[PDB]
Every structure is written in C-alpha cells, then in structure tokens.
Amino acid sequence: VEIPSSFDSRKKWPRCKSIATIRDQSRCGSCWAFGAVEAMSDRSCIQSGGKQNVELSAVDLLSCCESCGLGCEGGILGPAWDYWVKEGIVTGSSKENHAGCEPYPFPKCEHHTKGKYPPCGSKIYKTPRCKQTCQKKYKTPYTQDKHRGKSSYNVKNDEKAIQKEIMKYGPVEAGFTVYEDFLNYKSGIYKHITGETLGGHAIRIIGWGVENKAPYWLIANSWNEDWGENGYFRIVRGRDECSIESEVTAGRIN
Template sequence: MKLALLATVITVISAVNAAASTDDVNTAWNDFKLKYGKEYRSLYEEIVSKAIFAENFNKIVEHNSLYDQGLVKYSLAINKFADLSNEEFKNTFNGYKKRTSDVGDVVVVNFVPDQKTEIPDEFDWRKKGAVTPVKNQGRCGSCWTFSALHNHFQNGELEPLKVNIFLKTGILASISEQNLVDCSFEDGNAGCDGGDMNPAFTYVHNNDGIDSEEGYPYQGRDLPCRYITSANVTSTKGYGNIERGNEEHLKAAIATVGPIAVAIDASQSEFRLYHEGIYYNPSCSSGAIDPENELDHAVLAIGYGSENGEDYWLIKNSWGTDWGDDGYIKMARNRDNNCGVAADASYPLNY
C-alpha cells in the first residue's frame, strides 16, 4: 500500500516538474494559494493539487495564445477552481440532475411566443433592475436552486420567481435557496446531491410558498427542513417549459417573460476556467438526444445579444463574482444550441 502511494507521489512530482519548465508555474501557484487562502491537509494532497494546477495553468496559456490570435472567442484565467480535477469539480459543483415528480394540480404549460410582440435584438434584465447580485453556492450541488429561484417570488430568491414578483410589485428581494435544498426531497430533488428546477417549482406550489433568504439563510449543506410560514414570501401555480432546443423561443421568453432557468453542459474544463468573451466549445453537447445525461449544471439566462457578429446568451452563474466575468458568462447562441442552453429551459407561473 505504502509503495503504491509512493509511486503515485513520484509520478505526480514528475508531472509537476515536466509542466513547470520555468518559474512561471511556481510563481502562479504561490500567488494562487495566497489569493484564495488555499490550505491542504497533507503534503501529498498539495503535491497532487499542484500537479492539477500546473496542467490547468498550461491549458490556460495555450488557450489564451489562440485567443490573442483571434482563433477562439473567449479567454481563460486562473480562478479558485484551478487546483481541482475536472471530475472532482463536476461531482461537487455541477448539481443539475433531471428529475421527475408527481405534478398533481401543478399547472404545466408550453411557452408559445406572441406573434404580435416584436422581440428586440438584444436584452439584459440587469438594465431593468430585475436581477439580484451573483451568489456563491459553495461546495454544494445546489445550482438548481439558484437557477430556479430568480424569476418568480416577491420577496424571494428563485431568480425566475424574483422577477415575477418584481414585475408585479416593483420589489426585488431574495428567496431562500436553502429552503429548497432542505425541503424539496419529496418532490424529487436531492439537496446538495443535485436537483431540477421544475420539481423545485412543484415544491413551492405544493408547499404554498417559500421562505425569504433573510428568514431561511443559505448554509451550503444539507440540513433538516426548517420552513416556517411566517417567512413565506410568495408561491407559484406551476411552470412553463420552452420547446426543447428552440433558441428562438428561448429568446422570446427571456424578452417577454423574464430570466429563464436553464440546464447546460458545463462538463468541459474550459467552462470552469472561463474568464471573458463568448464561450463556444465544440466538445459541448446540445442536449438534444439525452438531456438527462448530457446536461449537468443549472444557470439563469438573463439576456442575449451580439458582439462582433457573434450571437450570445447572457448567463448568470452561482459560483461567486470571482468566477468568469464578475459571475457571468456569455455563451454562444444560434450555433446548434451549443452546450444545450435551450435544451431544458423553464420558468415559474404566477397566480
């Protein structure tokens, strides 16, 4: 056992040395540990983490060389995830898992664009004051709660629920993601082990509401359900679905309904190291064949536009403002639904 462990350590050390032909990696590694307060439980763990960091560092340098030549449309950067393997990262942070639940009397509709409404060429809900600050889900696969909770609630944090309240009352407040993490198991979700936005909407309907963030603050871990009716801020009668893979319908829904909860393929290492620009990845799935297995992360589509002739979706993530472009990412639009942005998209329905 000890010999096998020693062999592994030697292999990892060799990998670090091979990658670090100059002092660049060592300097970047020390800066990285200082900036993000990184501490490791053992020398072995630090050696392994540094080897992963070196690999990511080299990937970033090579990719950004292509970016500088105009051969790719987005850049990468060292961030707090740079010492994690892609597999470790996906298992911890990418928590979208397609679920099925008994909808009961939940209203479910299919979105149909109003043909009489002219859809603008670009849109950004932030400019209307209808988007709350970027949050950080932490080491919990709760991305589905942040995606779901924006568009619907009056004093709440489901992004789609938030905007619905905002449009009706002019009030933009935060709803409790932790309420969903702890309490929506019976509706098909699994807390920090993953979930789906539609069962989240179902829970809010069946529960006759959801608490405010102030009344039920986020903890980033599974805890016993502590919902209290006195902190309830809003409810929903059901949800609407966007036709799978229809980017024009998603565009219309964003402009006329509000920010839309979407599932995406965020399995590529370039996504977690994204910095700025329009993210297009030919290795990404479109989610057209098997969205249950092809999509792994939930985010919020808050707008769309074009930049230098390239169409994009404006996406709000839940990994903090120190990821991406202040917590946001522009993802390629009208490129065969790259990364599945329109493959599984929905929004809550107001009463």
C-alpha cells in the first residue's frame, strides 16, 4: 500500500468518537494504561465498523491487571494488551463525565503547564483497588460489560510498517523516553535537546504529517486538552527519536 504524506485517524474514522478524545491520567503514572485503553477504544470501533462505540475504562485496566506493573507507579505495554485479549476491559469515562461501568476516580489537573485546572503537583495517588463493580446507575453487571481483543502484538520498528498498521487497523500505543525538556513542550515538532531522563511515557500515535519538509508523528498525550497542542504533540518521525518507533504495541478484535 502507498503511504500518504499525511494521515489522521480522526479524519479517517470520524464516527468513532473515542479517536478525537483527549484523556487525563491525573496525579498517577497511568500513561501505560491510558495509551492502551484509548487505542483499544479506537480500534474496537474501527475494526467493528462502528458497532462498538465505547470509551474503555482506564481504571479497570490500571487497577485489575496484576501482570501490568506497578499501577500508578508505572506499567508495561505487552501485558496491558494481553489483559485486554484475555480478561477484557469494561467501559468507563473520565471522572467528570461519570459515564460507563467504571469511570476514572481522579480529577483533571495541569501537568507542568498553565491552565484552568488545578496543578497536578509532584505527589502520586495510590493505585486504585480493583472493584469489579459498575457504578449504580449503570445497569450492566461488571463481567458482562467486558470488551475483549482477539490478538495483540508488537509492531515492527520500521517507519513504513508502523504507518501501514495505523492506516489499516487504527491508532497504536507507543512507549518512548521522556526527557526533562518534554515537560516544557507547548507546541511544534518535538525532539530531545536538553534535560536528563525522566524514564518512559506511553502514548497513542494517531497519524503523521510533514511541515516545512519536517516529518512527524501526530500523537494524543493523556494530560488533558490544555497541555501541548490542545492535548496533542508532534515528534520527529523516521529517526527513532526517543525510541518512538521501537516500542509500538497494538492488537485486534478480530
């Protein structure tokens, strides 16, 4: 397949409401779980021809996956996608939207950037308990609100491979190395220039493009709409910038 100079999953599959959604981890290192449930939400819709049109619960995956790492202290992508395939994940919106089986317990906050929400600050919440209980207004039992994948896999660390994957099957989750200068991002095409490592971050790649000959990946961060470019950032594409092409993981419902 020929790869177009630009692609945006929001524009290809606009009936799928989750794709254009920007979420917020709040004061919790749950990026690993957000990147997953976001991409799973997008993909469940894309791959089902719009039959599933849900927001999958971040807290269910964060709190219930025992093999996924340390919860709010950080996680592991392979087991997150495996949990979706084997156990599945229920529905659940942000705290503020109070929708679905298990909405997120934690409120929006500003992540090292200016805005209308309270600053997140440096402290992290304890990983929520695995409650296995839909909110009282949601009239489906927890186990019966589960959405399951069929397969999961890591994507080849090749630019064209990642592009074909996104274009054909939907947004992917991707891990990358976060350096201090990432905290200072307001807009533009990011590359690492200053600052030391802050570990890793997991996000959702929704597309790609090119501006003034500079190619980039287009990515949804999970730090609310006030961070970066209305919740998104762009990063250099084609040079494994901060290992952005080397930790891609996704999966399929069928």
